[PDB]
Amino acid sequence: SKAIVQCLKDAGQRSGFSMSEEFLKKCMQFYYMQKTQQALILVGKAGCGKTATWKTVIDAMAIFDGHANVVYVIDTKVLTKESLYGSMLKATLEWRDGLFTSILRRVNDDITGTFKNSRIWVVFDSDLDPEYVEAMNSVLDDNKILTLPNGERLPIPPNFRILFETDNLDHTTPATITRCGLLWFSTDVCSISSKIDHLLNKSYEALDNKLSMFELDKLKDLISDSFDMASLTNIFTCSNDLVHILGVRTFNKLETAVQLAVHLISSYRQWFQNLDDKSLKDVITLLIKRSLLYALAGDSTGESQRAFIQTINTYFGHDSQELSDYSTIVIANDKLSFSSFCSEIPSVSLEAHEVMRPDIVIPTIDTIKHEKIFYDLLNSKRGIILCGPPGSGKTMIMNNALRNSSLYDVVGINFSKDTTTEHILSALHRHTNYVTTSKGLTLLPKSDIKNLVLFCDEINLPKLDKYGSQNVVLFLRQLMEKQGFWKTPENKWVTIERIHIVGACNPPTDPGRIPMSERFTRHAAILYLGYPSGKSLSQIYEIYYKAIFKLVPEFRSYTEPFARASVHLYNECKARYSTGLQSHYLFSPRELTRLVRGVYTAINTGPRQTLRSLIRLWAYEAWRIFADRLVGVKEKNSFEQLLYETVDKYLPNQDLGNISSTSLLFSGLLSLDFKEVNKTDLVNFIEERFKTFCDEELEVPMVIHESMVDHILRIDRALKQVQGHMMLIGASRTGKTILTRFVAWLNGLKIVQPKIHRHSNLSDFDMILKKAISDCSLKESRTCLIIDESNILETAFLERMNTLLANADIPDLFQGEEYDKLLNNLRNKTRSLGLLLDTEQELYDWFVGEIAKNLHVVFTICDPTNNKSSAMISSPALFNRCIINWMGDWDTKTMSQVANNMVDVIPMEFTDFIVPEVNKELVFTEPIQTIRDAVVNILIHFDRNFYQKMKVGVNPRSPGYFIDGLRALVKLVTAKYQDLQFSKTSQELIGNCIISSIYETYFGHLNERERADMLVILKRLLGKFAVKYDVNYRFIDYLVTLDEKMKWLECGLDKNDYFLENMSIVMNSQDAVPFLLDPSSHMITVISNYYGNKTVLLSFLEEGFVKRLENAIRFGSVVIIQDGEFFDPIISRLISREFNHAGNRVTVEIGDHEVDVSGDFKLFIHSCDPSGDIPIFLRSRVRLVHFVTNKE
C-alpha cells in the first residue's frame, strides 16, 4: 500500500494538487476498485474533482507499474449512435466503422506499437442514457464482446477499461449499475484555499518562464500572501446570500478570479520595476479587488455589486486602497503615474446620416466599463456568457469593443430551436482552415494570423432530447474544456487553435428558455447587462434628436422634449401592454432606435416642415412603431389617449387635430416627397392604379375601403426601408396576399411565391432560396419574397428562414465547391461593375450587403394560435426583424362600406313600405336611408349571429361567407327581375332572394335543426326591418324546377329533402368548388350519372394526378377528386379563382404549367370522413356541403 500512497503523493505534487484526506481517500478507492472491474462509473457535482482523481491515479500507476497509458476521451452524447458505433450505407454494404469500434480495431489488429504493454482508458465523459449503453450492453457482460449489426464480434482484451464520468444517474438502469463499479463523489475533494493555490501555480507555469527571476520571485510572493488571507474566505461566505443569475456555486468561480487577477497584474510588468513597495501594494490590491468583484458579483444586477464593493472594502484592511465601481487605472504622463479616474467620456459629434449607421454607439459610463471588462476577460482567454434581457445591449457592446480592435475578428451564429453542430461547423467553414500535423492530428486554425471570436447568440434555446441533453451545449463545453472535437466521418481528433467562445443569453426564467448544464456554465465568465436606467436613455436619444435636427436647425431646442416624450411613451407602453394580454407585446429600446431612424428618413425625404408638421410626423412614426402590433379597440383607444397625454406633457402646441391612425395618412406615392397627403386624392389614385393593375395582371374584383388604403400605406412604409421584413397577421379572405403583390407592383419589385406541395422537401426549398438569393445579388433584381405559414411544412424551413433574417445569407447553401464557384461568380460580377475586390471577405461583405438591401420577406399568417404560427411569432430571428402588422378582421364600418358598394350597382325598384319602418326600431346600426342600408344591416346582423351560433370563440371568422353571399345576391335578384319582366309579389322578391342567397352561402354544412334555428333568427331580422317576404316560402320550391327535381332522382339521388337542398346548393354554385363530405359513398355515382361518361375521377394519392389533371382541364372535362382530407397546394389557382388574363386566352399556373382553361371545366372535391381536417385556405374558399346522415 505504502508504495502506492507514495506514488500518489508524487503524482499530486507534480500536478500541483493538494493531497486532502478526501482526495487521498477517493484516489485509493478508485485504485482498488479498478483492479477487479472494467466498467467504472464516477458520479458527482460539476467540479467535484473526478477528472483530477482518475488522471492522478493513472499517473501513479504509470510510475509504479512502468506500463504506458493511452487515453481516449469521448464526449459521447455530442455524437449520434451511427457516428459512434457503425452503420450500413444506402445500398453499398461497406461498413463505416464508427469511432469506438475503429479505436477497438486499432487496439487489436495493429500488432505494431505497445498496446499490449499499455493500459487503454476510454472515457465516456457525458450524461448517459439507456439507448447508448444498451447498444454496448454485451461489453459490460462477462462476454466482454462488442457485438455489431454487421454480424461480427470484437473481443475486448483485459487492457481495455471504460470510465463513465458523469453527473447524474436519473436515466440509468440497475442492469448497468449492477455490472459497474459506482463511485459517488459525495463532496468537493479540496478546500477553496488549496484550489486557489493550485490555480496560482498553474498560471505561474505560463507567466514565470517569460519573466526574469528577480521580478518573478518578488511578484509571486507579493501576490500569494495577500490573495491567501482569511478575510477573502469571509467574503465568500458573504457571497452565498447574494442574488446570482444562473446560480453557479462559489467553488466554481475561482478560475475566473485567479486568471483575471494574474492576467491584469502581468500586464503591468514593464512599469512595476521602479515603484516603492507602498504604491506597488496599492496597485496589486486594487487589481485583485476588481477581479474578485467581477468574478463573484458580475452575475448580479448592479445594486448588488455596488453593495458588495462595501463588503470588499470592509473585509480587506482599511489601509489598502479603496475600491470604487467607477475606478479605472490610466497610465498618466510618464510610466508609473497611474490615475484612478472616472467619467473620461468623449463627446460624439454625430452627423445626421450617421443615425442609421448600425455600428454606432453612444459613449456612456456603463458601456465604457462593460467594454473594458469584456476585453479584459477575452484577453485572459476565458469563455464569457453575456446574459441579459432582450435589448440590453448584449451584442452592441461586443461589436463596439471588437470593431476598434484589429486582432479579434467575429463570427456570428444565431441559434434557434433546433440548431445543429453541422450548422456551427458550416458557419466556421468560411473563416477557418484545417491543417494536418502528426503532432496535433488535424489542427483547425483560423484562416489568418488574427484571433477569432464565435458569438453564439440565443445559446439557451436548442431543444433538448427527452433525457434533457441539448447536444450543442455539450459540444460547446467540449470546445472549451478540451480545445477540440472528434471528426466522426474521418474519426480523427481536431485541436482548435486561437478560437474563442462568447455566449449571449436571455434569462432562464423567460418563456421557452432551457436551464443549461452547470458543467458547461462553470467554464464561462458570466456577466449580467440591464436596461440603461431610463435617464441615460434620455441622454442617448437627446443626442440622436440633436443630430437629426441639424437638418431643421431652428427647431434644435426641442430635442430635449422630443427625447423625453420618446422615453415616456416607451415606458408607459412597456408597463400597460404586458405579455399577459398577448405573448407578442414585447418592447425593447430597439423600438426607439427604429423610431429615430424612421423620423430621420421621413424628414430627410420630406419638404419644409413646421412644428405642427413635426408633431404630426412624430405621431405617425409612433403609431407605426408601437401600435400596429396591438389588437383590441380598447387598446388602440388607450394608445390614442396615451399619445394625447404625452404630447400635452411635453409638446404643448396649438394646432394639433385628431391623431387617429386613419386621420394622418403620410404618403410618398402621389407626391415626389413624403408628406401627409389627402385621403380623397389617395382614394382616386389607388382606384385608377389598382384598376390598371387588375387589367394588366388578373381579374380579381376588389372594392377600395379605408382599411385597405391604410394597410397599403403601412406595407409601402415597410418595403421602402433598407432591410424591411414584414409580417401580416390576420384572417383569411382579407386581401393580404393580393395587397402585398399590389404594393410590390407599385414599387417595381419582383414577386416570388414558393411552389411547394405534398412532397416538396428541404432540398427543394433550398433550390428556391438559392435561386432567389442569386437573383438578388447577381441580377440585383430586388425581389419581394412572399411566404405563407402553409409553406413551412417542416421546421427545417423555419430554421433556414431564421438564419436568413438573422443574417443575410445561408452558409449551408454555399459550402465547399459551391463556395469556390460563388467566389468566381462574384469576381466576374464585381469586375463587370468596375469595382474590384480581391480577398474573399471583401466580396462576401459586398454580397451580404446587396442581399441586405435587395431582399424583402413578407410572412402572412392566417391563425396565430396554430402551433406553426406560434413558432413563427415566437422565433427570435423573425420577431426581432419583422415589422408586425395586425390586420386581424373586418369591422362593422368596413363591412358596411363594402356591402354598400356592391349593393349600389344592382337596380332596386321602388317599394312604398320601405320608408315608414325607419321610424320604429332605431337599433343604430347604419345611417337611416333606404333598402340599400336595410339589406346591408340584415347581412351584417346575420353574419354576426351565425358566428355566435357556430361556437367560433375568438378571431377565426373571415368575411368569406359575407362576400360570397353578397355576390350571389346580385345574380339572384337581377335574374328574378328578368323573370318578372306581381303588385303583391315584386316586393317580397328582396326577402326571398336574401333567404336564397343565405342558404347557398351558409347552410351547406348545417344540420336540419341548425338550419331551422338560422331560418328563425334570420326571419325575425327581416320582420325587424321593412323586408317583407313570402310567409309560405320554401327554398326547394323557390329554387328548383320540377325537371331538375326529377332529373336528380333519375340520377339516383335519395328522396330525402335534406339531400335535395344539398344537391340544389352544389349544382347552383357558379365559380365556387363544392366539397362533398359524404362518408356514405353514393355522391361519386350520382354526379357521374348526371354528367355521364365525361366524368373523370382523380385522387390526391394517384401520383400521376397533376399531369392528368392538366390534361383534363385541356379537355374541359368534369373532374371529381377523391380523398379530401389531403390537399395538394399546387391546385390552389383552380380553387381560389384567379387566372392571368390574356387577349386570346385566359391562363392559369398549375405549377409551372401555364395552362389555358377550356372554359367548360368543373371541379368537385369529395371526402370520406369528417374527422379529416380541411386546410383553412380551402375551408374559406370552397363550398363545404355535408350529406352525412343525421339522426335529427
Ligand SMILES: Nc1ncnc2c1ncn2[C@@H]1O[C@H](COP(=O)(O)OP(=O)(O)OP(=O)(O)O)[C@@H](O)[C@H]1O
Ligand atoms: N487536490 C486538489 N488540489 C488542488 N486543486 C484541485 C484538487 N482537486 C481538484 N482541484 C481543482 O478542481 C478543479 C475541478 O475538478 P475537475 O477538473 O476534476 O472537474 P470535474 O469534477 O471533473 O467536473 P466536471 O463534471 O465539470 O468534469 C480542477 O481543475 C482543479 O483545479
Ligand SMILES: N#Cc1c(C2(c3ccc(Cl)cc3)CC2)nn2c(O)c(Oc3cccc(Br)c3)cnc12
Ligand atoms: N441601435 C441600437 C441599440 C440600442 C440603443 C442603444 C442603447 C445604448 C447605447 Cl450606448 C447606444 C444605443 C438605441 C437604444 N440598444 N440596443 C440593444 O440593446 C441590442 O441588444 C441586443 C442584441 C442582440 C440580441 C438582443 Br435580444 C438584444 C441591440 N441593438 C441596440
Ligand SMILES: N#Cc1c(C2(c3ccc(Cl)cc3)CC2)nn2c(O)c(Oc3cccc(Br)c3)cnc12
Ligand atoms: N377576390 C378576392 C379576395 C378576397 C375576398 C375579398 C376581400 C376584399 C375585397 Cl375588396 C374583395 C374581395 C373575397 C373575400 N380575399 N382575398 C385574400 O385574402 C387574398 O390574399 C390571401 C390569400 C390567401 C390567404 C390569405 Br390570409 C390572404 C387574395 N385575394 C382575396
Ligand SMILES: [Mg+2]
Ligand atoms: Mg471533469
